[PDB]
Design a protein around this ligand. Sequence first.
Ligand code: LM7
Length: 264
Amino acid sequence: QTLLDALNVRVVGSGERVLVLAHGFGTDQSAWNRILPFFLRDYRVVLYDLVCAGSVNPDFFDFRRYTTLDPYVDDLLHILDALGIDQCAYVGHSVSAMIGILASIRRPELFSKLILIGASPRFLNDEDYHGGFEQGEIEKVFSAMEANYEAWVNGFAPLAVGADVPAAVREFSRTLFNMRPDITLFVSRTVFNSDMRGVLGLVKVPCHIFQTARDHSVPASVATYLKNHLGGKNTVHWLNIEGHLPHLSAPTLLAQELRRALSH
Ligand SMILES: O=c1[nH]c(=O)n(-c2ccc(O)c([N+](=O)[O-])c2)c2ccccc12
């Protein structure tokens, strides 16, 4: 209840079937603004801000608490229990895909299906696994972010959007620049340190894996990896959308693909 207020929980739409939209890194729930109109007639939509969002009071971001994805999972389950949700479809972008995977292992009855967008269980390369990033490269990123946060945002946002969609570049820049820099750096280490490979097989809920073309954060092989390793019935959607942020860059097409996945 003070948690619902703290994380800007919003419930809209005319339907009864519950659809949770959970934003990822560098954004807030406003990233779903252009999807949302397509779900109000036939869903009950639940949106919230991760505690790291620039829209959330930075006083709530307890560095002693939010050291792994688990406490983010506790926030998500607290919200669904407080709303009296006993079953939903969940859409998680970026880190929210991994949050939803973990939540479903904790509460396998709460989710009818997960829709994962721009999802990766591991970013760092090793001898047996390609995530797309070297440890040395990530360190240099953290240094740049510390040196000049604004410059870092303005250099990274075009790469994350990927396609030449200047409105989405401005929009992602906007929400990243609203995040407090100390929070952004800490969350960025949470993201790069994540390793969800050992838990994928514990998932038993069906997963739709939405993979864009030329996603700077997620090589194509990682979407294949999720399809092979998630424990339940998996479907890969190879979206006709370029870049990591299809909800910002191609909302009308992403909305129709979500509608299709949520039907069957
Ligand atoms: O240089 C980066 N390259 C990246 O691809 N990411 C990143 C990794 C995972 C993601 O889900 C996102 N994202 O933008 O939602 C971004 C970063 C995430 C935080 C900080 C820096 C970076």
